[PDB]
Design a binder for this molecule. Structure first.
Ligand SMILES: [Mg+2]
Ligand SMILES: [Mg+2]
Ligand SMILES: [Mg+2]
Ligand SMILES: [Mg+2]
Length: 254
């Protein structure tokens, strides 16, 4: 009976993907993109391959390419089924990535984070594995929707350290949930209403490990196009001395 209802109205955001190796990593091990299904629904994908394990770029490209293949083959995903579609496809891809890593001795142990978003008229449905992020931003507030699967965030969430301490912690890079390392994964799923926000941001930690939320909001709330803001936001991460790959998708909410 939930499916006895009207088809989803067409809704895209103007969105663009930005990525840079940066000056301190051998490879760009981030990956991602903006994909469209056969009814022109939109999926945003960003993945941060693990630098401390082999073949991060293989893992992130694999998960991105799988999501692209799978979503472009789809016709329609109803709003109320979007969480299930993302959870089931992330779980499947994770299982496939686990075996790919186990079998190919050049890539043993590889894995990646994944944050992704399926866009609807009035809402976005986000799935998250790892410490890449999704935010909504307006002139008053910048809200992180996801919760990092990182060890320092476990310390924050148990009151062992403060957010500022986590930002400077020597173990800040360690992650607690990632694609490819185990046969099973439980992604976090979120639904966010879009009505009074101006931007949806998906990003790798190359951005937010060096640029605080306040700075991102101040940039994004000035007059500017998505191209201007993306170019400036990338420059800001570099000027803040990011030692990582920096990747993000900015999507303007109309
Ligand atoms: Mg990485
Ligand atoms: Mg590597
Ligand atoms: Mg991190
Ligand atoms: Mg990173």
């Amino acid at each position: 009976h939930h499916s006895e209802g009207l088809v989803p109205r067409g809704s895209h955001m103007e969105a663009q993907f930005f990525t840079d190796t940066g000056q301190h990593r051998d490879k760009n091990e981030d990956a991602g993109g903006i994909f469209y299904n056969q009814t022109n629904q939109q999926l945003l994908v960003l993945c941060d391959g693990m630098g401390g394990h082999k073949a991060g770029e293989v893992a992130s490209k694999f998960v991105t390419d799988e999501l692209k293949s799978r979503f472009e083959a789809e016709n329609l995903i109803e709003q109320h089924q979007a969480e299930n579609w993302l959870r089931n496809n992330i779980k499947d891809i994770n299982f496939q990535l686990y075996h790919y890593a186990q079998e190919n001795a050049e890539y043993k142990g590889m894995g990646t984070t994944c944050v992704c978003a399926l866009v609807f008229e009035k809402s976005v449905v986000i799935a998250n594995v790892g410490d890449s992020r999704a935010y909504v931003i307006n002139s008053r507030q910048i809200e992180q929707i996801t919760s990092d699967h990182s060890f320092v965030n476990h310390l924050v969430l148990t009151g062992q350290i403060t957010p500022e301490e986590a930002f400077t912690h020597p173990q800040r890079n360690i992650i607690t949930k990632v694609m490819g390392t185990d046969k099973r994964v439980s992604p976090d799923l979120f639904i966010k209403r879009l009505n009074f926000y101006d931007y949806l941001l998906l990003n790798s930690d190359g951005l937010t490990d060096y640029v605080k939320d306040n700075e991102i909001k101040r940039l994004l709330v000035k007059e500017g196009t998505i191209e201007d803001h993306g170019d400036q936001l990338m420059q800001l991460a570099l000027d803040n001395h990011s030692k990582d790959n920096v990747t993000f998708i900015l999507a303007a909410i109309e």
